[PDB]
């Protein structure tokens, strides 16, 4: 009785392990991430978040990637040192264990994730996707 | 104000463009596909669907790759040569819209998609992922 949840909360690949894929989030008003492990990893892999803009050369292809300014919660005791927004999966996460995350405030039309410095060779195993849940049109 | 939609409708990479990926669905009770193109296409692509069962080794390794059969609706009235419910992505589709497929009848714990013969070359520009609906832990 599995309904067609393709429409009505679709999903797209964010990070396959080799390259990023900027994805539009305009038509949707909310969204979130999903992380998955394919093999045991050596360190707590880190990732940098970026947001793009509609490039004025063509208002369909995204522009360059800018680091997004995460706003800390009211009791975020430890906040980003200077890496305005980023994520870091804890070490010792095994396969068949999905992970969830999101940012509180967006500032563009395209979101992208990249393996942050020093965690590339371990990011070649984790897969990342994005789920959006808006219609807006 | 995006919610934590990582949990509550997650998602996982299905067909990346190079190699399929068995995804657990025992976990939940309603799931669906989201197809996407990355560039221009050629003669419409064809994808076969496969299901796995718990292998006698890891009681959690998707077993062999057996093909899910086809079931008709009230007026499905349109039947392939065999059963074996597959899908055909029609060409002339731009990387700005998505396709939403969903098999109504499931059997097993690991769904998988494979590029049918005469489509792999044209399927290399296809990105397919699956997202679930329930939690049912």
């Amino acid at each position: 009785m599995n309904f067609n949840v393709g429409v009505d909360f679709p999903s797209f690949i964010a990070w396959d392990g080799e390259e990023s894929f900027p994805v539009k989030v305009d038509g949707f008003n909310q969204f979130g991430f999903t992380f998955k492990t394919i093999a045991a990893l050596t360190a707590a892999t880190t990732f940098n978040i970026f947001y793009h803009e509609p490039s004025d050369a063509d208002p369909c292809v995204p522009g360059p990637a800018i680091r997004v300014p995460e706003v800390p919660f009211c009791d975020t005791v430890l906040l980003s040192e200077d890496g305005l927004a980023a994520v870091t999966l804890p070490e010792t996460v095994t396969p068949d264990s999905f992970c969830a995350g999101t940012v509180p405030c967006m500032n563009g039309q395209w979101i992208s994730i990249a393996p942050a410095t020093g965690s590339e060779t371990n990011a070649a195993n984790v897969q990342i996707t994005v789920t959006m849940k808006g219609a807006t049109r | 104000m995006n919610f934590n939609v990582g949990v509550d409708f997650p998602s996982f990479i299905a067909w990346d463009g190079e190699e399929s990926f068995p995804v657990k669905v025992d976990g939940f009770n309603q799931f669906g596909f989201t197809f996407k193109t990355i560039a221009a296409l050629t003669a419409a692509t064809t994808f076969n669907i496969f299901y796995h069962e718990p292998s006698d080794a890891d009681p959690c390794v998707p077993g062999p790759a057996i093909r899910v059969p086809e079931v008709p609706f009230c007026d499905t009235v349109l039947l392939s040569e065999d059963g074996l419910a597959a899908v055909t992505l029609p060409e002339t589709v731009t990387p700005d819209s998505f396709c939403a497929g969903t098999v109504p009848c499931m059997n097993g714990q690991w769904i998988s998609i494979a590029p049918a013969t005469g489509s792999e070359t044209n399927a290399a520009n296809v990105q397919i992922t699956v997202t679930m609906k329930g939690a049912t832990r």
Partner: peptide
Amino acid sequence: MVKLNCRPLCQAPTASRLVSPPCFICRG
């Protein structure tokens, strides 16, 4: 700052080596 809920997937059964203290009375 992004959180990381897991509620992981698959479930490995335990097994158990339940004891029922062995049979003896000897002391020497």
